[PDB]
Amino acid sequence: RDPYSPSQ
Amino acid sequence: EIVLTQSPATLSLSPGARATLSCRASQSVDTYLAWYQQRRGQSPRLLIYDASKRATGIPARFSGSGSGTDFTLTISSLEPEDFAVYYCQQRNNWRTWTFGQGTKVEINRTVAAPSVFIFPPSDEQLKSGTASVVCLLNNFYPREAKVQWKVDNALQSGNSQESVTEQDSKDSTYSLSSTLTLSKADYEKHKVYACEVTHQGLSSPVTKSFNRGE
Amino acid sequence: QVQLVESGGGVVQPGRSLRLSCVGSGFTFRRDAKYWVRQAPGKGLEWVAAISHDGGEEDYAESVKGRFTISRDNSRETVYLEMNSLRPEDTAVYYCATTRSGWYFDYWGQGALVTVSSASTKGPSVFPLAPSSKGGTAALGCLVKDYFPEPVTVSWNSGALTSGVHTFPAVLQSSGLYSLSSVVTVPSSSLGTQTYICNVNHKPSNTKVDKKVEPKS
Ligand SMILES: *[C@@H]1O[C@H](CO)[C@@H](O[C@@H]2O[C@H](CO)[C@@H](O[C@@H]3O[C@H](CO[C@H]4O[C@H](CO)[C@@H](O)[C@H](O)[C@@H]4O)[C@@H](O)[C@H](O)[C@@H]3O)[C@H](O)[C@H]2NC(C)=O)[C@H](O)[C@H]1NC(C)=O
Known part of the structure; x- marks a missing residue:
């Protein structure tokens, strides 16, 4: 749950 | 953290x-x-x-x-x-x-001692109420250099600012200016203004000085 | 390819607000987080703000938290930085950046300069740095004092003299005004064989000063 990981 | x-x-x-x-x-x-x-x-x-x-x-x-x-x-x-x-x-x-x-x-390059020049304030600036004294350290290496201002042999502090160029594209040296800012009144209350420069390329600190009004 | 273009920089007085924009092209803008990283003059890089791909998450450095707001409009491929209650130490080049994973700043904009100061626009006074008739090289120059904002330009003899010229970076004085020196070193025999004129231009105040520099009486 990385709040700043890219959209999937 | x-x-x-x-x-x-x-x-x-x-x-x-x-x-x-x-x-x-x-x-x-x-x-x-x-x-x-x-x-x-x-x-x-x-x-x-x-x-x-x-x-x-x-x-x-x-x-x-x-x-x-x-x-x-x-x-x-x-x-x-x-x-x-x-x-x-x-x-x-x-x-x-x-x-x-x-x-x-x-x-990197070989050690180069700075040549030092001191500039008194212009008469035009003194008519405005401020005195700027400029010390120039030209084409030196390495970067580390210490400049000390002396007014009637009294070491100064908090009234000077330094500025340095980037490494020269030809000889890879630095140049540096130090500017002493005094009021017209404080400038007229002293005689000898000296810039003392310490650098690795100098065997002894070089001092450039002038007497106000000569 | 990936490109980021900032806009909105300028001069602003302390306590006022300024809004920066950054438009992306050549990639899917909505896919990844967006960031602002700033660099004060002569200083290192300082991350400022971050926002998630859809704007659901935002975070800030403690130095700007409560004063700055980062936002994005993906339909316009734009990320914004709203800066309120600006302080002189907020003066910096502000870079916008995008990531491939959220961890690193994979691509950077060109930067937008923000200068926070209460100083009014003022042209410089130009004073000669006159050589003294007292080692083969002689130094002369011009002192360009008490101007705002940056920059000034200095040439010598309308650009005909460039060898040996050093125009130093401006210094910010305690008065809020800038000052710099421009100096030239020449062979000692050249002091009398040539005229030396510094051409100083300060466009923000439309100030032009030409000063002939000669040894003093
Ligand atoms: C970056 O630049 C620096 C200079 O700004 C470099 O430091 C300099 O390094 C040189 C040589 O390493 C020093 O020059 C001389 O070194 C000799 C020693 O070499 C003697 O070797 C044999 C004995 O084994 C002897 O037979 C030879 O005749 C040589 O004399 C000394 O004897 C000299 O007195 C002189 O020092 C510089 O002194 C030194 N400068 C400084 C400021 O340290 C540095 O190496 C450069 N770095 C890189 C990575 O390139």
Whole structure:
């Protein structure tokens, strides 16, 4: 749950 | 919190030499570390990420290594464009990104002592109520230089400012100016104004001075 | 390819607000987080703000938290930085950046300069740095004092003299005004064989000053 990981 | 620190402040090397830059994290960051290059007057650009992966388009002479708390950026053979400032970067607790304080890679050369010049304030400026005294240190290497202002043999502090050029594109030297700012009144209350310069290329500190009104 | 273009920089007085914009092209803008990283003059890089791909998450450095607001409009491929309650130490080049994973700043903009100061626009006074008739090289120059904002340009003899010229970076004085020196070193025999004129231009105040520099009586 990385709040700043890219959209999937 | 996690603090990154970099070493050395200045790395002085010849073109074509191998450069080794260090980055230290106050706690382990695993291999989550990036390196950036910032050439003079240009935006930073990503070189290495995840400690050792090259960004797309980055030449093979850049490599990264390390884990935990100690990391290295290696430039196998320096190119002219590689003389720049390099930053490392990490990210802790998902919501904070931090940098090291940067390492400057400069062109190494032989020691060159500065030639020193002192400039009294102009009569035009004294008619405005302010006196500026300028000391010039021309074409020296290495960067470290100490300038001290003396007014009637009294050492000054807090009333001078220094400015330095970038390494000269021809001889790789620096030049520096030191400006002493006094009021018209304070300037007229003293006689001898001296600039004392200490530098590695000088066997003894060089003093340039003038007497006000002569 | 990936490109980021900032806009909105300028001079602003302390306590006022300024809004920066950054438009992306050549990639899917909505896919990744966006960031602002700033660099004070002569200083290192300082991350400022971050925003998630859809704007659901935002975070800030403690130095700007409560004063800055980062936002994005993906339909316009734009990320914004709203800066309120600006302070002189907020003076910096502000870079916008995008990521491939959220961890690193994979691509950077060109930077936007923000100068926070209460100083009013003022042209410089130009004073000669006259050589003294007292080692083969002689130094002369011009002192360009008390102007705002940056920059000034200095040439010598309308650009005909460039060898030996050093125009130093400006210094910010405690008055809020800038000052710099521009100096030239020449062979000692050249002091009498040539005229030396510094051409100073300060466009923000439309100020032009030409100063002939000669040894003083
Ligand atoms: C970056 O630039 C620096 C200079 O700004 C470099 O430091 C200089 O290094 C040179 C040589 O390493 C020093 O010059 C001389 O060194 C000799 C020693 O070499 C003697 O070797 C044999 C004995 O084994 C002897 O037979 C020879 O005749 C040589 O004399 C000394 O004897 C001299 O007195 C002189 O020092 C410089 O002194 C030194 N400068 C400084 C400021 O340290 C530095 O190496 C450069 N770095 C890189 C990575 O390129």
